[PDB]
């Protein structure tokens, strides 16, 4: 999830926008 | 530079990036 | 939660939401 | 600049995307 994308990870704008809403 | 966004600093960067969208929580 | 971008914290906004495009500095 | 309006005071993303490049 959010959490292994872009805190584990590094995540892009569009992965995060995806999470949005 | 941390690039990760973990904890309150990933809530801030969908705050800015979601703007009238909102987001979960 | 800080919704203010500071320091390293405002390069890693720049990072994220600028991404290809690059910027300064 | 960016300082103020970003750091000081608080951006949106339209903001932020105007200091890319």
Redesign the interface.
């Known amino acids: 999830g959010?959490?292994e994308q872009?805190?584990?990870?590094?995540?892009?704008?569009y992965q995060?926008?995806n999470?949005?809403? | 530079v941390n690039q990760h966004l973990c904890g309150s600093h990933l809530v801030e960067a969908l705050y800015l990036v979601c703007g009238e969208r909102g987001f979960f929580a």
């Open positions: 959010i959490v872009c805190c584990t990870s590094i995540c892009s704008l995060l926008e999470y949005c809403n």
